Amino acid sequence: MTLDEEYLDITFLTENGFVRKRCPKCGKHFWTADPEREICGDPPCESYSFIGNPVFKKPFELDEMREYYLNFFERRGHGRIERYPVVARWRTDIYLTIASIADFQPFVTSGVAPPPANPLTISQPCIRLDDLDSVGRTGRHLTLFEMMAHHAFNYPGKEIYWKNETVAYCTELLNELGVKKEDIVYKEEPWAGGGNAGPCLEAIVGGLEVATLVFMNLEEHPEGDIEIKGARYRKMDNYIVDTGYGLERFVWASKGTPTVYDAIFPEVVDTIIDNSNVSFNREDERVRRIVAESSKLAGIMGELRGERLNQLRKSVADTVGVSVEELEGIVVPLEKVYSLADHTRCILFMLGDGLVPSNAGAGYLARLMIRRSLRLAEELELGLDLYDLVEMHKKILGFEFDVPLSTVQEILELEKERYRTTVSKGTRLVERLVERKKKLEKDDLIELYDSHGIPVELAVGIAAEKGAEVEMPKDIYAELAKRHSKAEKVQEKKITLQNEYPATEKLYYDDPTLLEFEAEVIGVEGDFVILNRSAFYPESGGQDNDVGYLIANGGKFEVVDVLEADGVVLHVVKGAKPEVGTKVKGVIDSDVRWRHMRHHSATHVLLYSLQKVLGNHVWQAGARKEFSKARLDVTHFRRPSEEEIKEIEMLANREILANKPIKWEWMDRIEAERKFGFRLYQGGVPPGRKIRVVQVGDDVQACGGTHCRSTGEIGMLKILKVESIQDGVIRFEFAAGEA
Template identity: 55%
Template sequence: MLEDEYQLDYFKENGFVRKQCPGCGKNFWTRDHERELCGDPPCVSYSFIGNPVFKKEYDIPSMRETYLSFFERHGHTRVKRYPVIARWRDDIYLTIASIADFQPFVTSGLVPPPANPLTVSQPCIRLDDLDAVGRSGRHLTNFEMMAHHVFNSRGNEIYWKDRTVELCDTLLSELGLDLNAVTYKESPWAGGGNAGPSVEVLVGGLELATLVFMNLKQTKGGPIDIKGESYEKMDTYIVDTGYGLERFVWASKGSPTIYDAVFPNIVAGLMELAGLEHSIENPEYARIFSQNARFAGVMDISGQANLLQLRRKVAESIGTTVEKLQEIMEPVETVYAITDHSRCLAFMLGDGIIPSNVKAGYLARLVLRRTLRMMRDLGIKVPLSDIVEMQIRNLPEYPEFRERIDTIREILMLEEEKFADTIQRGSRLVRKTALHFKEKKQSMPLGELILLYDTHGIPPEITREVAKEEGVDVELPDTFYSLVAKKHCKAEEEEKQALPLDIPPTRKLYYEHPAQSEFEATVIEVIGNKIILDQTLFYPEGGGQPADHGTLSLDDIAVNVVDAQITNGIILHETDSSFGFKKGDTVKGKIDMERRLAHMRHHTATHIVNEAAKSVLGRHVWQTGAQKSTDRARLDLTHYKRISDSEFREIELLANRVVMQDLPVIIKWMDRVEAEKRYGFVLYQGGVPPGKEIRILKVGNDVEACGGLHVPNTGIIGPIKLIKTERIQDGVERIEFSAGEAAVKHIQERDELLNRSAETLRVTPEQLPDTVNRFFEEWKDLKKESERLKAELAEVRVKAIMSEAVGINGLRVISKKIPQADVDELIKAATEFSKDDDMVAILASDLGGVKLVVSAGGHAQKLGINSGAIVREISKLVGGGGGGRPGIAQGGGTDAGKIDEALRRGVELVRERVE
């Protein structure tokens, strides 16, 4: 970053001096000409603890209101907070900063901001420093970023760097802060595709705010490098500030940690539940605890940091042993982390995230299971839902969380059950994995821990415990959870086909004339068998709706259009022929309207089923995917448990009521900002469309941004028949359904199956359930009788065959073919033989190929007879395979002509073992 980015007139005119910190080597600005260090840990320790920097104490609500009111007085418009799940973004899952509310459309200049300048207090979630939470005294996963933003453009500047620093100085002064104690540390910033110079506002070792001057956008091959990424200058330039609400409260109180300042009651309650309250009265504990708080800033568990080394530094600084410091601080730090995580979960679940194995749901489950694991370590027995409810009661400014408390409680209870099951099953899997590395004489690498966590949900601490029991070392870094969170916090970028730069966007006739089936167009470009036209009626695949099919013709020759895709507004028509269309040709297009109508019915029905599911299951439901075809559609929804039969029927009934109301399907283009203000981010259930204007679809109570094609009213859809529901991922339910003619055909197929089944049983369809139930009960009785008779038959056969046993060195060996016996009969007979300790039975049958069963009594096994090994070898002779336990095993093959040879070989194997 260029040096002159930080040469502010405000600094020069107000007595600031620029210095370089000997600790970290970074530059900073200060009014205190004697100051040497930048004021940022680990260069300095916390000096405000026990020595508050403001003239009075604040709590969260009062500090928030003081901040917002200050900026309102200085010409800023207050705007409402956004959700912590970034519904308006397709690149990140969580709202990581206040500027994320306005990326990418506002920051790029494509869309105007909701106000300019504005101020907001935005709840955020960042999991990059998950492992430092509780330890550093200041890190939070969930925090509120107070901010003021200005969106400048060339020729229209509201204010820039000098005014930004002046406002910060003025605010701190009004709060009663000694401005000589403030340092402004230079630090380039990057995030969410943007970057710029910034200054960190430091007081008493605490970063209270960051003032970012965002004037760069991430560009491949850009000339400016920040943190390993390439950027270039933007036409817009933005004041992006972030003031830590919780840190301001902490600085006003001077509490030992941010957790004591913000959550004193919850910390005290968890300390009591963990049995830690008695330590506070211990003088040595009190001394170490208070001194540790001042040096906790160095406990920044990030990058390649080693927790033990950092802890040793603190122990040396306060004059105690690292062992004593760990004994006192680790349980307290765990309480702090649980306190933080439980508030994070209140926001995640309160804003509608459903724990799952993907996207934002994965991150919610990461925090949730880490919390449960820490509660387990401390022996806290109360349900996690009790702690999260306690947090929600402490958040009166978020009434929407209290409205969802029943759903939140049920989600957490189910997640606790799943976690307990994971621990139980996971221990067996870890043991097996550990033995694998033990055989190789290797430690278990980090990659294996991440795989076990990602695939099976097994916490690394459990993996380490179980592996240690097997004598296997585990590579578990102190930053494990931060690494995993960072890996899952962003969406993968889709590769798009590169197109010539001079091609204009295709005119979308399918929006202008959706009922029209034929059109003329000019060929703009031909790329292989893909054709670009100046305008088209062909709908390109998008929003889960398949592309239109049809034909393109020139004179008397026609080609089939088998696909259509859109890239940067340009539509490519894929054909099944190499017929030589060329640039400038005028072609005629014709759409397969029967296929399109089926897609339109299913697409409109998807919106109706989605809204019906929300009405039945709860407003937490969010569409995660959809796909339509001509004969059916599927809709994937976030939901924390299986959809019951009664809920399934209710969703179907509500959807068909909307159809029967013959409601108009309203489609209109709206300004993005206006649409978001009116409808909220529920607009983006099917994805986030680009552009200043977005296409809004309203069907009954469902309102979404949607680029798909739809029927003009719900009556045209015809019946909606829900076919099935299934869980495709933990936390994601899929509903399959048909609409219109496809629904009628599906109902007819079901009726035919019902009638044929009734006819087979010679009853009416109405009598079918009772008849099937009666037959099923009779079948179970017959099966029990069959099992009893097979057991009796096995006893009879054993007695009859026993006399044919051959003596081999003290063992009696039976080798017998039992014609047409099924495998159950062979197993029962073999089991009877094995009750005799000296008996080995080798039995075969030619029913449906070759069935082989071998058993060995207890004494026979002690002599080394292994039924599994015998079966494996003799099964090869009959063209098959098998195996099992030493006591009994089964196998078989296809070559019945080799049964006798297999039986003889079985006897030879016994003989070879004992003679």
Template identity: 55%
Template structure:
């Protein structure tokens, strides 16, 4: 453990604290109260601040945030702006879960400097792992602001460490008016994200207000320090990582029964009005119920395997109240509290550009949306989600960006509500089918299947339970269902595995990094280099002008010349900074050795096509943002020689008018012939200057970023580009399609490829016009007229077919063989399709005593059988007859007792098919 990491903390000894062991849980804690026996953390202690605020002055969110930030500014910390709640700078998590997440991994690892040191921030965070506890415990939130002060120390440059951190916390609480004797600091070693360190939890009145982490360890196989079952070693740098809960500080300052009454008083009141619920905290008896409930709500955490009904009973017993009466009061209010919280969560999610979908952060947004809609439905509140979000925005003037983006947010929520309704309508049958299937096996519908159904079809467990009950099946799901689902989707699997799969990795480990000159001289296509190694069909050079595949751009191709030998370069890849050239060795021997001088020649036409398409991608992405909104985010891209594609996050299909506008803006940027600018910048400086839109095309590694500016688009990009937008040439959008929910794909061509694409389109128009002997400009009108005429002819054709079938049927019935009262129709023709045979069979079925076997030699054999009502009663089934006929011609078929269809490829068996089917009819009728 980390006991030794607490030994150098002198603040407690020097300021009258007693080190104690909690009489209930056994944890070590520090307190100024010599008589205290418990640590202050529920359930060892209940809330004591309800009705008796901890701080002198009640504050709202804005007041408390400003107080905190100003406090640390006055003590030498630089205030920095918040980061988005979607962690654009990370490839391991989707949402910003703590203030320290803003600086991971690059700042915390020491790779890049922090934006300020020391610094203070109030960072909005989202955590969904306690989703089912929100509203029920009185304290849980999905969205919260983590007020913090951070210090990034390094060897020889310490700003402050453990004692000063605790001193600042103590001073802050005292200034706010907390009773110093009530404050406890609990020893609580921390580990997470590959790091660990000593930590203390700060408790006042039974409420955890802050956590002070002293991060100085990193996970290591060779480590000697055991923290929670993993081994760690000391880092060169050491970090003060603090977290102060803004909402909890506000709650502590007001002493309201729940955190929701303190944080969302206006929203809660408006929601209770809409639901027709009286939530009058001025009523002493009513307020006391909530206060008592909140004081014991520390046990109401359903994020684990706890059962809500059992927990509710424990709370009811603790406050001396009937559990049913407590549930009657608390259930609707818990939904109100959760809706208030969830809609604030959505305000941040959608306001920061998350588009609901079935993947990544979009999945989590949709999860919150659908849970909120479900609770509104339970309360009978019929109000658009956007109206509640608008209330939050009105109460958060410190975030003007949410007001700016509200039009998009409103439209997204309206579409999501409609999708949810459609999901429920089609989902009931899906769940009923699954429930019955498991019941027939004598099993209950397992949790894994419920979660799979939610993942695949979006059917909430409450709906699943209702739908299954309609078919007599009981379905059970845990109270923490949504937390489990959220936990499954909270981390990304998109980490880069650059060197994986290359079988010669060990050969590269001893080589120096390749000098890459394709950025320095982008128009140079011929160069000299020294061979560092050559093996199999791969060559590694000391420098190269060949661009290796990356960033959605295909690799360069070209030639390597060694003396009189010439080799085609067919692929180029980079592994951990070393560029590997793959040669075409078909019918050749590799006669290149280490130390040889070679000449490389890049295929200029291919390179220019890639550069045009890469620059065009930046231009198209920027134009899409201007037309569709600032929420547009690149979800993927590919640049080839003949065309390119860009996948963007968007909540609906792109219209043709929008496509035209995007194309027009893109080509205006080209015609402006703006210089494409390149700049290498320190990562932190670039993020502060340009924001996280830099990472549209992915998150490049390293301390220094290559910044590419194309018009008003600014991104960190490692691709090759044109030197000015004019070189891109014309940009032509070829098509758009939805590749998955929430992601639209644009395909386009630039330069010569665009001209070729337009010429191909013109050729199609010209050829079509020539076939119709008309001018191209009247082609649409002519095609429309021909189409309408074709539809009329189709109708007339169907009508004639029906009349012909009727006439043929009359003839068939006249020629039918009679067996007792039954008419046996047998017909073998040539050229009739299955539809013609079916229409004839339908006519024959009008006679309840008729049986028909109809065969036609048409692309093999088509077979249709029909049996009237009385024939079926006698035991004749059309499906059996079709099977007999189909098997005789080498095929298969089937259908209903009255009408069936089939056939097979072997026309030589048609006579056998007729004979065997007729025999079956006669045998059945005579039995």
């Protein structure tokens, strides 16, 4: 069934007065229930029509509309669920939450795990950096926004509800708010993201897309069949209702203010204006008349650049009255007030949710937003600090964060200092480059941002200032952001044994002190001795590989190293190798095993201690292997002071001395997450319907390594070295129960 005929499947549209057309007006197919006319749509010929004339019954406040939407589906069988953080801790393919459906990928959407409820409803804060360049310009784009949704997870033979019920829900909700089906347009478009896709319907009312309804039955797979924005997708066994209603867009359509920004955080926009170099006044009836008429077309000209929006700029300039220049005398400065207002809000969530600024990973996106905000504040000569705007955003929303405003302030203050030094020597650097190249390219502006932290608009300006050939590239930030939106490709990859073997019976999971066992050689490839069951720990998780030997009716075969291949453990032996079928008595070296057990259990205690002392922004930076030393990398915005380090060590040793219990047991994912939160994935996200959960004291992680039985077995913990590997990442080298 093709995407096209996938829409001819929905009996709800035709049975409710909706007829399929194709204007063009965007050139796509769409469904309208209005018999009078079709020229309907969003981007090209419609424009906002609700500005000054709300389209909903009453004007809702952010929190009221949020509650109204959630209760609406709760009284319709949907289970309410709390938002997920904006940092995708539960996965490893993407850094931030780009859609509510992203909370449930890839384990729930693939069936590996069950959804929190079914069907469920939620208001998920999302971050869309790809819209960065249109923020503040179209009147409808934000970087951080809440996508309200109702999801239903269907499996073959078990359907909660599909397309008909989905579209019916959106119409009903809309109608109940004050919009008649005659004014609701459903445009057809494909939707993909996070590894899934499907045909979708965009709900367009008043010239604005307020929600999208996706019938998810496609999943990204190598042998893909469907082509959607570069990726290939095949039809899944499961199918999912994937909807998303923009809370801020609903509120905006309920107030009819000039822009979404004036609808969700007017205080912030006003404050910025009142404390900047804005040439106009937010009370003048004149200015108000200009913005209003311009706001109505924002959706059109906002999606254009160059000679494109250049003409519409004239259209509105005429109708309004004054010249194009006067128009730009307000719109352009406002585009920056709206962006700063928006960006400081996105910072609230990135920082409040645990992101630490850096030049790598998700931290890079945090630093990207902050630098751009610092640059916007500078252009406007903001009389307040970014922090002041963030705190304001915080009290308006009323949300609670893992990271307190206190730490947020500290981070923004340090970023501001780094930015100050960057710009100082950065101006000269670009002035110099202009004398040399006289023509700056897209890749030139890229290198300047990444290698010298120079804001693109700061470099494109100085260049033009010196009469240099250069022009603001399309989605340059989205381009920079896109280059840092997902986890890089780690070439540490798979080993494929020439023969298929039954998954090794790992014996170390249950008993960490089982150094001796009995097994049979069920295969031998090169140096890879393979048994049916073994206590030997393969080089993985956080601890290094075991070392020992296999005894049998043949002598003693020393195992020097141990890897693994898709479940089969490999015992590396050279020269005198066992005969496939021999029965052996494996003996693991006690010292090597205990050393790793202590240090690995210490890693947990240390991680727990680091968070308690430094703050909830502390998260394991990663374990990019090299086990020469016992090390732990974490996200922290500066070097720990000597007293903090002293305090980290002290707290860990009090935990060890307390000799708390260390436990482990296989647990279903949903059960684990519900009980321990996403702090469960600090060391990575493992696959499986059931994950091994380890509890070292009060720290809880999905871990597959061998640990001590109680924290007292770790021995004293001594921090031997604290180093700043890279901005936002600090390395702790330590010893546990030894030198």
